[PDB]
PDB file of C-alpha atoms in Angstrom:
ATOM      1  CA  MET A   1       7.444 -11.122  -8.883  1.00  0.00           C
ATOM      2  CA  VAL A   2       8.503  -6.797  -9.274  1.00  0.00           C
ATOM      3  CA  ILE A   3       5.889  -4.117  -8.200  1.00  0.00           C
ATOM      4  CA  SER A   4       6.189  -1.122  -9.815  1.00  0.00           C
ATOM      5  CA  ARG A   5       3.539   1.691 -11.189  1.00  0.00           C
ATOM      6  CA  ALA A   6       1.527   2.762 -13.315  1.00  0.00           C
ATOM      7  CA  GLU A   7       0.871  -1.390 -13.504  1.00  0.00           C
ATOM      8  CA  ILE A   8      -2.180  -3.625 -14.248  1.00  0.00           C
ATOM      9  CA  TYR A   9      -3.010  -6.167 -11.456  1.00  0.00           C
ATOM     10  CA  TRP A  10      -5.704  -8.610 -11.480  1.00  0.00           C
ATOM     11  CA  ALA A  11      -5.872  -9.463  -7.401  1.00  0.00           C
ATOM     12  CA  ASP A  12      -8.861 -10.716  -4.700  1.00  0.00           C
ATOM     13  CA  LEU A  13     -11.284  -7.308  -3.817  1.00  0.00           C
ATOM     14  CA  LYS A  14     -14.468 -10.551  -6.371  1.00  0.00           C
ATOM     15  CA  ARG A  15     -11.438 -10.469  -9.004  1.00  0.00           C
ATOM     16  CA  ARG A  16     -11.230  -7.279 -10.993  1.00  0.00           C
ATOM     17  CA  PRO A  17      -8.113  -5.780 -12.301  1.00  0.00           C
ATOM     18  CA  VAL A  18      -6.175  -2.937 -10.276  1.00  0.00           C
ATOM     19  CA  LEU A  19      -4.022  -0.505 -11.574  1.00  0.00           C
ATOM     20  CA  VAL A  20      -1.152  -0.150  -8.034  1.00  0.00           C
ATOM     21  CA  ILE A  21      -0.401   3.736  -7.420  1.00  0.00           C
ATOM     22  CA  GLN A  22       1.201   3.257  -4.901  1.00  0.00           C
ATOM     23  CA  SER A  23       4.931   4.360  -5.574  1.00  0.00           C
ATOM     24  CA  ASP A  24       7.890   2.613  -6.006  1.00  0.00           C
ATOM     25  CA  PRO A  25      10.263   3.222  -3.766  1.00  0.00           C
ATOM     26  CA  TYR A  26       6.912   1.783  -1.315  1.00  0.00           C
ATOM     27  CA  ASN A  27       6.401  -0.644  -3.776  1.00  0.00           C
ATOM     28  CA  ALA A  28      10.140  -1.942  -3.913  1.00  0.00           C
ATOM     29  CA  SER A  29      10.344  -0.974   0.540  1.00  0.00           C
ATOM     30  CA  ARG A  30       9.820  -3.377   2.586  1.00  0.00           C
ATOM     31  CA  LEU A  31       5.869  -2.853   2.964  1.00  0.00           C
ATOM     32  CA  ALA A  32       3.587  -6.293   2.883  1.00  0.00           C
ATOM     33  CA  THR A  33       0.985  -3.333   1.272  1.00  0.00           C
ATOM     34  CA  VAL A  34       0.592  -1.823  -2.716  1.00  0.00           C
ATOM     35  CA  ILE A  35      -2.017   0.722  -2.461  1.00  0.00           C
ATOM     36  CA  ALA A  36      -3.874   0.485  -6.322  1.00  0.00           C
ATOM     37  CA  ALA A  37      -7.560   2.222  -8.028  1.00  0.00           C
ATOM     38  CA  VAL A  38      -9.725  -0.343  -8.844  1.00  0.00           C
ATOM     39  CA  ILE A  39     -10.579  -0.425 -12.213  1.00  0.00           C
ATOM     40  CA  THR A  40     -14.213  -1.768 -13.719  1.00  0.00           C
ATOM     41  CA  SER A  41     -15.584  -2.791 -16.597  1.00  0.00           C
ATOM     42  CA  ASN A  42     -18.813  -0.599 -16.606  1.00  0.00           C
ATOM     43  CA  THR A  43     -17.962   2.457 -18.939  1.00  0.00           C
ATOM     44  CA  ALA A  44     -20.887   4.514 -17.672  1.00  0.00           C
ATOM     45  CA  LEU A  45     -18.518   5.218 -14.032  1.00  0.00           C
ATOM     46  CA  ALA A  46     -16.838   6.890 -17.090  1.00  0.00           C
ATOM     47  CA  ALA A  47     -19.168  10.349 -17.306  1.00  0.00           C
ATOM     48  CA  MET A  48     -17.962   9.986 -13.306  1.00  0.00           C
ATOM     49  CA  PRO A  49     -15.127  13.363 -13.213  1.00  0.00           C
ATOM     50  CA  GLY A  50     -11.807  12.047 -11.869  1.00  0.00           C
ATOM     51  CA  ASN A  51     -12.579   8.171 -13.454  1.00  0.00           C
ATOM     52  CA  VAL A  52      -9.961   7.860 -16.190  1.00  0.00           C
ATOM     53  CA  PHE A  53     -11.503   5.241 -19.878  1.00  0.00           C
ATOM     54  CA  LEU A  54      -9.007   2.777 -21.079  1.00  0.00           C
ATOM     55  CA  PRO A  55      -9.583   1.753 -24.107  1.00  0.00           C
ATOM     56  CA  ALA A  56      -9.174  -1.950 -24.282  1.00  0.00           C
ATOM     57  CA  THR A  57      -5.958  -1.694 -26.833  1.00  0.00           C
ATOM     58  CA  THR A  58      -5.179   0.473 -23.875  1.00  0.00           C
ATOM     59  CA  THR A  59      -5.047  -1.837 -21.303  1.00  0.00           C
ATOM     60  CA  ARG A  60      -4.231  -5.391 -23.352  1.00  0.00           C
ATOM     61  CA  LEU A  61      -7.256  -6.246 -21.151  1.00  0.00           C
ATOM     62  CA  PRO A  62     -10.586  -7.699 -22.170  1.00  0.00           C
ATOM     63  CA  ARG A  63     -13.540  -4.740 -22.780  1.00  0.00           C
ATOM     64  CA  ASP A  64     -12.826  -1.136 -22.675  1.00  0.00           C
ATOM     65  CA  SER A  65     -12.266  -0.395 -18.767  1.00  0.00           C
ATOM     66  CA  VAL A  66     -13.244   2.389 -16.764  1.00  0.00           C
ATOM     67  CA  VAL A  67     -10.117   3.514 -13.901  1.00  0.00           C
ATOM     68  CA  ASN A  68     -11.982   4.553 -10.738  1.00  0.00           C
ATOM     69  CA  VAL A  69     -10.042   7.547  -8.858  1.00  0.00           C
ATOM     70  CA  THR A  70     -12.983   7.600  -6.518  1.00  0.00           C
ATOM     71  CA  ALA A  71     -13.139   3.498  -5.384  1.00  0.00           C
ATOM     72  CA  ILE A  72      -8.787   3.253  -3.638  1.00  0.00           C
ATOM     73  CA  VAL A  73      -7.817  -0.460  -1.821  1.00  0.00           C
ATOM     74  CA  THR A  74      -5.129  -1.439  -0.389  1.00  0.00           C
ATOM     75  CA  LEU A  75      -3.941  -4.378  -0.737  1.00  0.00           C
ATOM     76  CA  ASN A  76      -1.032  -7.306   0.370  1.00  0.00           C
ATOM     77  CA  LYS A  77       2.098  -7.035  -2.379  1.00  0.00           C
ATOM     78  CA  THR A  78       1.207 -10.894  -2.510  1.00  0.00           C
ATOM     79  CA  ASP A  79      -2.743 -10.699  -3.521  1.00  0.00           C
ATOM     80  CA  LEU A  80      -1.137  -9.639  -6.801  1.00  0.00           C
ATOM     81  CA  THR A  81      -1.290 -12.152  -9.127  1.00  0.00           C
ATOM     82  CA  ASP A  82      -0.932 -12.434 -12.745  1.00  0.00           C
ATOM     83  CA  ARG A  83      -0.382  -8.841 -14.629  1.00  0.00           C
ATOM     84  CA  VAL A  84      -2.175  -7.719 -17.482  1.00  0.00           C
ATOM     85  CA  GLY A  85       0.198  -4.847 -18.506  1.00  0.00           C
ATOM     86  CA  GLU A  86       0.472  -0.865 -17.710  1.00  0.00           C
ATOM     87  CA  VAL A  87      -1.134   2.277 -18.898  1.00  0.00           C
ATOM     88  CA  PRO A  88       0.242   4.947 -21.194  1.00  0.00           C
ATOM     89  CA  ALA A  89       2.203   7.997 -19.191  1.00  0.00           C
ATOM     90  CA  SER A  90      -0.241  10.352 -20.631  1.00  0.00           C
ATOM     91  CA  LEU A  91      -3.298   8.350 -19.347  1.00  0.00           C
ATOM     92  CA  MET A  92      -1.504   8.009 -15.982  1.00  0.00           C
ATOM     93  CA  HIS A  93      -1.267  11.539 -15.865  1.00  0.00           C
ATOM     94  CA  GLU A  94      -4.958  12.270 -15.763  1.00  0.00           C
ATOM     95  CA  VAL A  95      -5.556   9.464 -13.750  1.00  0.00           C
ATOM     96  CA  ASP A  96      -2.994  11.341 -11.979  1.00  0.00           C
ATOM     97  CA  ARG A  97      -5.037  14.847 -11.499  1.00  0.00           C
ATOM     98  CA  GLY A  98      -8.116  12.751 -10.854  1.00  0.00           C
ATOM     99  CA  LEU A  99      -6.254  11.453  -7.666  1.00  0.00           C
ATOM    100  CA  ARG A 100      -5.525  14.738  -6.987  1.00  0.00           C
ATOM    101  CA  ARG A 101      -8.954  15.809  -7.053  1.00  0.00           C
ATOM    102  CA  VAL A 102     -10.732  13.574  -5.293  1.00  0.00           C
ATOM    103  CA  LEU A 103      -7.858  13.593  -2.583  1.00  0.00           C
ATOM    104  CA  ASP A 104      -7.352  17.223  -2.376  1.00  0.00           C
ATOM    105  CA  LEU A 105      -3.954  16.822  -3.414  1.00  0.00           C
TER     106      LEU A 105
ATOM    107  CA  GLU B   1     -25.518   9.028  13.660  1.00  0.00           C
ATOM    108  CA  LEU B   2     -25.687  11.877   9.875  1.00  0.00           C
ATOM    109  CA  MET B   3     -23.997  14.600  10.757  1.00  0.00           C
ATOM    110  CA  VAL B   4     -21.634  15.859   8.140  1.00  0.00           C
ATOM    111  CA  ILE B   5     -18.940  13.847   5.808  1.00  0.00           C
ATOM    112  CA  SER B   6     -16.165  16.496   5.792  1.00  0.00           C
ATOM    113  CA  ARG B   7     -12.495  16.158   5.376  1.00  0.00           C
ATOM    114  CA  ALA B   8     -10.405  16.555   7.604  1.00  0.00           C
ATOM    115  CA  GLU B   9     -12.454  14.837  10.114  1.00  0.00           C
ATOM    116  CA  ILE B  10     -11.867  12.821  12.066  1.00  0.00           C
ATOM    117  CA  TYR B  11     -15.185   8.816  12.200  1.00  0.00           C
ATOM    118  CA  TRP B  12     -15.695   5.124  13.928  1.00  0.00           C
ATOM    119  CA  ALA B  13     -15.913   2.436  11.119  1.00  0.00           C
ATOM    120  CA  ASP B  14     -16.040  -0.535  10.359  1.00  0.00           C
ATOM    121  CA  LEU B  15     -12.841  -2.305   8.911  1.00  0.00           C
ATOM    122  CA  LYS B  16     -13.607  -4.236  13.718  1.00  0.00           C
ATOM    123  CA  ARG B  17     -14.266  -0.918  14.675  1.00  0.00           C
ATOM    124  CA  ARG B  18     -11.665   1.554  14.379  1.00  0.00           C
ATOM    125  CA  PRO B  19     -10.922   4.878  13.913  1.00  0.00           C
ATOM    126  CA  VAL B  20     -10.063   6.861  10.294  1.00  0.00           C
ATOM    127  CA  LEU B  21      -9.337   9.901   9.005  1.00  0.00           C
ATOM    128  CA  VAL B  22     -11.334  11.435   6.063  1.00  0.00           C
ATOM    129  CA  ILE B  23      -9.240  12.389   3.245  1.00  0.00           C
ATOM    130  CA  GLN B  24     -11.965  12.354   0.213  1.00  0.00           C
ATOM    131  CA  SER B  25     -11.999  16.056  -1.191  1.00  0.00           C
ATOM    132  CA  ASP B  26     -15.249  18.563  -0.649  1.00  0.00           C
ATOM    133  CA  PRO B  27     -16.770  18.343  -3.450  1.00  0.00           C
ATOM    134  CA  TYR B  28     -16.853  14.093  -3.723  1.00  0.00           C
ATOM    135  CA  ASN B  29     -17.740  13.860   0.309  1.00  0.00           C
ATOM    136  CA  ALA B  30     -21.512  16.124  -1.082  1.00  0.00           C
ATOM    137  CA  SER B  31     -21.700  14.220  -3.725  1.00  0.00           C
ATOM    138  CA  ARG B  32     -24.141  11.305  -3.809  1.00  0.00           C
ATOM    139  CA  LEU B  33     -20.434   9.383  -4.105  1.00  0.00           C
ATOM    140  CA  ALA B  34     -22.303   6.044  -1.684  1.00  0.00           C
ATOM    141  CA  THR B  35     -17.647   5.796  -1.612  1.00  0.00           C
ATOM    142  CA  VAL B  36     -15.881   7.866   0.905  1.00  0.00           C
ATOM    143  CA  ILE B  37     -11.828   7.711   0.765  1.00  0.00           C
ATOM    144  CA  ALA B  38      -9.771   8.248   4.709  1.00  0.00           C
ATOM    145  CA  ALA B  39      -6.873   6.792   6.367  1.00  0.00           C
ATOM    146  CA  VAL B  40      -7.080   4.491   8.149  1.00  0.00           C
ATOM    147  CA  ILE B  41      -6.192   5.624  12.485  1.00  0.00           C
ATOM    148  CA  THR B  42      -3.524   3.459  14.609  1.00  0.00           C
ATOM    149  CA  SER B  43      -2.874   3.358  18.174  1.00  0.00           C
ATOM    150  CA  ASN B  44       0.363   2.112  17.931  1.00  0.00           C
ATOM    151  CA  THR B  45       2.747   5.019  18.535  1.00  0.00           C
ATOM    152  CA  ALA B  46       5.635   2.877  17.302  1.00  0.00           C
ATOM    153  CA  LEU B  47       4.118   3.763  13.868  1.00  0.00           C
ATOM    154  CA  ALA B  48       4.360   7.636  14.079  1.00  0.00           C
ATOM    155  CA  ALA B  49       8.477   5.960  12.775  1.00  0.00           C
ATOM    156  CA  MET B  50       7.980   5.186   9.360  1.00  0.00           C
ATOM    157  CA  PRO B  51       7.482   8.382   6.606  1.00  0.00           C
ATOM    158  CA  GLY B  52       4.147   9.673   6.125  1.00  0.00           C
ATOM    159  CA  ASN B  53       2.927   9.179   8.818  1.00  0.00           C
ATOM    160  CA  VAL B  54       1.472  11.833  11.576  1.00  0.00           C
ATOM    161  CA  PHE B  55       1.496  11.131  15.146  1.00  0.00           C
ATOM    162  CA  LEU B  56      -2.036  12.794  16.524  1.00  0.00           C
ATOM    163  CA  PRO B  57      -2.540  14.028  20.390  1.00  0.00           C
ATOM    164  CA  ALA B  58      -5.624  12.915  21.970  1.00  0.00           C
ATOM    165  CA  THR B  59      -5.394  16.386  23.310  1.00  0.00           C
ATOM    166  CA  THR B  60      -5.913  17.792  18.775  1.00  0.00           C
ATOM    167  CA  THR B  61      -8.364  14.946  17.991  1.00  0.00           C
ATOM    168  CA  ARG B  62     -10.338  14.225  21.465  1.00  0.00           C
ATOM    169  CA  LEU B  63      -9.218  10.416  20.727  1.00  0.00           C
ATOM    170  CA  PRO B  64      -8.968   7.701  23.756  1.00  0.00           C
ATOM    171  CA  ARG B  65      -5.278   7.905  23.667  1.00  0.00           C
ATOM    172  CA  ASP B  66      -2.314   8.799  21.212  1.00  0.00           C
ATOM    173  CA  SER B  67      -3.107   7.732  17.094  1.00  0.00           C
ATOM    174  CA  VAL B  68      -1.471   7.682  14.710  1.00  0.00           C
ATOM    175  CA  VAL B  69      -2.035   8.664  10.425  1.00  0.00           C
ATOM    176  CA  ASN B  70      -1.114   5.651   8.770  1.00  0.00           C
ATOM    177  CA  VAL B  71      -0.680   6.539   5.259  1.00  0.00           C
ATOM    178  CA  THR B  72      -0.010   3.525   3.451  1.00  0.00           C
ATOM    179  CA  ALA B  73      -3.406   2.128   4.850  1.00  0.00           C
ATOM    180  CA  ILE B  74      -5.787   4.306   2.881  1.00  0.00           C
ATOM    181  CA  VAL B  75      -9.351   2.039   2.817  1.00  0.00           C
ATOM    182  CA  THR B  76     -12.955   2.840   0.659  1.00  0.00           C
ATOM    183  CA  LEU B  77     -16.458   3.121   2.724  1.00  0.00           C
ATOM    184  CA  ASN B  78     -19.444   3.599   2.246  1.00  0.00           C
ATOM    185  CA  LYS B  79     -20.527   7.130   3.375  1.00  0.00           C
ATOM    186  CA  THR B  80     -23.691   4.855   6.107  1.00  0.00           C
ATOM    187  CA  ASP B  81     -20.826   2.805   7.222  1.00  0.00           C
ATOM    188  CA  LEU B  82     -19.434   6.492   9.148  1.00  0.00           C
ATOM    189  CA  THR B  83     -20.382   6.160  12.547  1.00  0.00           C
ATOM    190  CA  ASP B  84     -19.543   8.559  15.789  1.00  0.00           C
ATOM    191  CA  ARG B  85     -18.282  11.599  15.033  1.00  0.00           C
ATOM    192  CA  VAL B  86     -14.777  12.377  17.076  1.00  0.00           C
ATOM    193  CA  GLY B  87     -13.681  15.439  16.134  1.00  0.00           C
ATOM    194  CA  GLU B  88     -11.269  17.028  12.719  1.00  0.00           C
ATOM    195  CA  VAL B  89      -7.754  17.251  12.407  1.00  0.00           C
ATOM    196  CA  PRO B  90      -6.182  20.450  12.732  1.00  0.00           C
ATOM    197  CA  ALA B  91      -4.793  21.898   9.582  1.00  0.00           C
ATOM    198  CA  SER B  92      -1.225  21.772   9.794  1.00  0.00           C
ATOM    199  CA  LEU B  93      -1.198  18.241  10.330  1.00  0.00           C
ATOM    200  CA  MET B  94      -3.473  17.585   7.968  1.00  0.00           C
ATOM    201  CA  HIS B  95      -1.297  19.751   5.477  1.00  0.00           C
ATOM    202  CA  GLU B  96       1.646  16.809   7.138  1.00  0.00           C
ATOM    203  CA  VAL B  97      -0.918  13.854   5.953  1.00  0.00           C
ATOM    204  CA  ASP B  98      -0.947  15.597   2.201  1.00  0.00           C
ATOM    205  CA  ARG B  99       2.380  15.449   2.406  1.00  0.00           C
ATOM    206  CA  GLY B 100       2.718  11.932   3.146  1.00  0.00           C
ATOM    207  CA  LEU B 101       0.181  10.428   1.006  1.00  0.00           C
ATOM    208  CA  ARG B 102       1.670  12.622  -1.901  1.00  0.00           C
ATOM    209  CA  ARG B 103       4.911  11.171  -2.029  1.00  0.00           C
ATOM    210  CA  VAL B 104       3.466   7.591  -0.677  1.00  0.00           C
ATOM    211  CA  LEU B 105       1.106   7.937  -3.911  1.00  0.00           C
ATOM    212  CA  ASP B 106       2.927  10.297  -6.261  1.00  0.00           C
ATOM    213  CA  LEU B 107       1.409  13.577  -6.197  1.00  0.00           C
TER     214      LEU B 107
END
Protein backbone atom coordinates (compact mmCIF):
# COMPACT_ATOMS: atom_id res chain seq x y z
CA MET A 1 0.00 0.00 0.00
CA VAL A 2 0.96 3.66 -0.41
CA ILE A 3 2.51 5.17 2.72
CA SER A 4 2.12 8.95 2.89
CA ARG A 5 2.99 11.58 5.46
CA ALA A 6 0.23 12.87 7.79
CA GLU A 7 -1.50 9.47 7.53
CA ILE A 8 -2.42 7.39 10.59
CA TYR A 9 -1.87 3.63 10.67
CA TRP A 10 -2.12 0.78 13.15
CA ALA A 11 1.18 -0.85 13.99
CA ASP A 12 2.82 -3.27 16.41
CA LEU A 13 5.27 -1.45 18.67
CA LYS A 14 1.16 -3.69 21.58
CA ARG A 15 -0.96 -2.61 18.61
CA ARG A 16 -1.12 1.19 18.73
CA PRO A 17 -1.77 4.01 16.23
CA VAL A 18 1.04 6.00 14.67
CA LEU A 19 1.25 9.15 12.54
CA VAL A 20 3.67 8.99 9.61
CA ILE A 21 6.18 11.84 9.80
CA GLN A 22 8.76 10.50 7.33
CA SER A 23 8.77 12.57 4.14
CA ASP A 24 7.04 11.19 1.07
CA PRO A 25 10.32 10.97 -0.95
CA TYR A 26 11.68 8.47 1.59
CA ASN A 27 8.27 6.81 1.86
CA ALA A 28 8.23 6.13 -1.90
CA SER A 29 11.91 5.12 -1.95
CA ARG A 30 13.16 1.55 -1.49
CA LEU A 31 13.89 2.33 2.19
CA ALA A 32 12.45 -0.47 4.33
CA THR A 33 11.77 1.81 7.34
CA VAL A 34 9.22 4.55 8.04
CA ILE A 35 9.52 7.08 10.89
CA ALA A 36 6.36 7.84 12.87
CA ALA A 37 5.14 9.53 16.04
CA VAL A 38 3.05 7.52 18.48
CA ILE A 39 -0.59 8.48 19.04
CA THR A 40 -1.89 7.89 22.56
CA SER A 41 -5.44 7.78 23.86
CA ASN A 42 -4.30 9.30 27.18
CA THR A 43 -5.33 12.89 26.45
CA ALA A 44 -3.44 14.05 29.56
CA LEU A 45 -0.30 14.00 27.41
CA ALA A 46 -1.72 17.03 25.58
CA ALA A 47 -0.35 19.12 28.46
CA MET A 48 3.18 18.13 27.43
CA PRO A 49 4.44 20.94 25.15
CA GLY A 50 4.65 20.08 21.46
CA ASN A 51 2.12 17.24 21.58
CA VAL A 52 -1.02 17.74 19.49
CA PHE A 53 -4.62 17.00 20.50
CA LEU A 54 -6.68 15.17 17.86
CA PRO A 55 -10.48 14.96 18.22
CA ALA A 56 -12.04 11.64 17.26
CA THR A 57 -14.11 13.48 14.65
CA THR A 58 -10.82 14.47 13.00
CA THR A 59 -9.06 11.09 12.83
CA ARG A 60 -11.98 8.63 12.45
CA LEU A 61 -10.39 6.94 15.48
CA PRO A 62 -12.51 5.48 18.31
CA ARG A 63 -11.63 8.15 20.91
CA ASP A 64 -9.90 11.50 21.24
CA SER A 65 -6.15 11.13 20.88
CA VAL A 66 -2.84 12.98 21.24
CA VAL A 67 0.20 12.92 18.96
CA ASN A 68 3.19 12.47 21.29
CA VAL A 69 6.05 14.15 19.43
CA THR A 70 8.50 12.96 22.11
CA ALA A 71 7.70 9.32 21.26
CA ILE A 72 9.20 8.72 17.81
CA VAL A 73 9.56 5.20 16.42
CA THR A 74 11.12 3.73 13.28
CA LEU A 75 8.99 0.90 11.89
CA ASN A 76 9.20 -1.44 8.94
CA LYS A 77 6.86 -0.35 6.16
CA THR A 78 5.45 -3.89 6.38
CA ASP A 79 4.36 -3.29 9.98
CA LEU A 80 1.81 -0.70 8.79
CA THR A 81 -1.51 -2.50 8.41
CA ASP A 82 -4.94 -0.85 8.32
CA ARG A 83 -4.89 2.87 7.58
CA VAL A 84 -7.04 4.97 9.91
CA GLY A 85 -7.18 8.29 8.09
CA GLU A 86 -5.33 11.56 7.73
CA VAL A 87 -4.47 14.57 9.89
CA PRO A 88 -5.62 17.94 8.46
CA ALA A 89 -3.07 20.49 7.31
CA SER A 90 -3.60 22.82 10.29
CA LEU A 91 -3.08 20.12 12.91
CA MET A 92 -0.22 18.66 10.88
CA HIS A 93 1.36 22.12 11.00
CA GLU A 94 1.02 22.03 14.78
CA VAL A 95 2.71 18.60 14.73
CA ASP A 96 5.52 19.96 12.54
CA ARG A 97 6.14 22.84 14.93
CA GLY A 98 6.16 20.46 17.89
CA LEU A 99 8.65 18.19 16.13
CA ARG A 100 10.97 21.09 15.28
CA ARG A 101 10.69 22.16 18.92
CA VAL A 102 11.58 18.78 20.43
CA LEU A 103 14.35 18.08 17.88
CA ASP A 104 15.93 21.57 17.75
CA LEU A 105 15.18 21.85 14.04
CA GLU B 1 26.89 6.98 34.89
CA LEU B 2 24.59 9.92 35.64
CA MET B 3 26.29 12.72 33.63
CA VAL B 4 24.12 15.27 31.81
CA ILE B 5 21.87 14.25 28.91
CA SER B 6 22.76 16.99 26.43
CA ARG B 7 22.17 17.26 22.71
CA ALA B 8 24.96 16.51 20.23
CA GLU B 9 26.32 14.02 22.77
CA ILE B 10 27.01 10.38 21.91
CA TYR B 11 26.08 7.63 24.34
CA TRP B 12 26.11 3.85 24.50
CA ALA B 13 22.67 2.31 24.80
CA ASP B 14 20.84 -1.00 24.57
CA LEU B 15 18.53 -1.03 21.55
CA LYS B 16 22.42 -4.95 21.48
CA ARG B 17 24.67 -2.19 22.85
CA ARG B 18 25.14 0.40 20.09
CA PRO B 19 26.05 4.10 19.99
CA VAL B 20 23.41 6.79 19.63
CA LEU B 21 23.49 10.53 19.04
CA VAL B 22 21.11 12.62 21.14
CA ILE B 23 18.90 14.77 18.91
CA GLN B 24 16.21 15.69 21.45
CA SER B 25 16.31 19.38 22.32
CA ASP B 26 17.92 20.39 25.60
CA PRO B 27 14.68 21.85 27.09
CA TYR B 28 13.12 18.38 26.90
CA ASN B 29 16.41 16.76 27.95
CA ALA B 30 16.41 18.79 31.18
CA SER B 31 12.69 18.21 31.76
CA ARG B 32 11.21 15.28 33.67
CA LEU B 33 10.54 13.50 30.35
CA ALA B 34 11.65 9.91 30.88
CA THR B 35 12.42 9.45 27.16
CA VAL B 36 15.19 10.87 24.98
CA ILE B 37 15.11 10.81 21.18
CA ALA B 38 18.31 9.71 19.43
CA ALA B 39 19.66 8.73 16.02
CA VAL B 40 21.51 5.44 15.61
CA ILE B 41 25.22 5.54 14.78
CA THR B 42 26.51 2.65 12.67
CA SER B 43 30.07 1.55 11.98
CA ASN B 44 29.11 0.55 8.42
CA THR B 45 30.59 3.60 6.67
CA ALA B 46 28.91 2.58 3.40
CA LEU B 47 25.74 4.18 4.78
CA ALA B 48 27.45 7.56 4.36
CA ALA B 49 26.39 7.38 0.70
CA MET B 50 22.73 7.37 1.77
CA PRO B 51 21.54 10.99 1.57
CA GLY B 52 21.17 12.78 4.89
CA ASN B 53 23.44 10.45 6.86
CA VAL B 54 26.56 12.05 8.33
CA PHE B 55 30.08 10.60 8.51
CA LEU B 56 31.83 10.94 11.89
CA PRO B 57 35.60 10.30 12.12
CA ALA B 58 36.74 8.33 15.14
CA THR B 59 39.18 11.13 15.97
CA THR B 60 36.22 13.49 16.34
CA THR B 61 33.86 11.31 18.41
CA ARG B 62 36.37 9.26 20.47
CA LEU B 63 34.36 6.26 19.23
CA PRO B 64 36.07 2.92 18.46
CA ARG B 65 35.84 3.24 14.67
CA ASP B 66 34.75 5.70 12.02
CA SER B 67 30.98 5.92 12.12
CA VAL B 68 27.91 7.24 10.32
CA VAL B 69 24.84 8.89 11.82
CA ASN B 70 21.86 7.19 10.16
CA VAL B 71 19.18 9.89 10.22
CA THR B 72 16.56 7.42 8.98
CA ALA B 73 17.03 5.28 12.13
CA ILE B 74 15.51 7.27 14.99
CA VAL B 75 14.82 5.68 18.39
CA THR B 76 13.18 6.89 21.60
CA LEU B 77 15.03 5.58 24.66
CA ASN B 78 14.64 5.96 28.40
CA LYS B 79 17.13 8.43 29.87
CA THR B 80 18.21 5.57 32.15
CA ASP B 81 19.26 3.50 29.12
CA LEU B 82 22.05 5.97 28.34
CA THR B 83 25.17 4.57 29.98
CA ASP B 84 28.74 5.64 29.22
CA ARG B 85 29.07 8.98 27.46
CA VAL B 86 31.40 8.87 24.47
CA GLY B 87 31.83 12.53 23.54
CA GLU B 88 30.26 15.23 21.41
CA VAL B 89 29.67 15.98 17.74
CA PRO B 90 30.98 19.39 16.60
CA ALA B 91 28.52 22.08 15.60
CA SER B 92 29.23 21.71 11.86
CA LEU B 93 28.60 17.96 11.71
CA MET B 94 25.53 18.35 13.94
CA HIS B 95 24.28 20.98 11.50
CA GLU B 96 24.65 18.44 8.71
CA VAL B 97 22.70 16.02 10.92
CA ASP B 98 20.01 18.69 11.43
CA ARG B 99 19.70 19.21 7.68
CA GLY B 100 19.40 15.47 7.10
CA LEU B 101 16.72 15.25 9.80
CA ARG B 102 14.77 18.16 8.30
CA ARG B 103 14.96 16.40 4.93
CA VAL B 104 13.79 12.98 6.11
CA LEU B 105 11.07 14.49 8.34
CA ASP B 106 9.94 17.26 5.93
CA LEU B 107 10.82 19.95 8.47
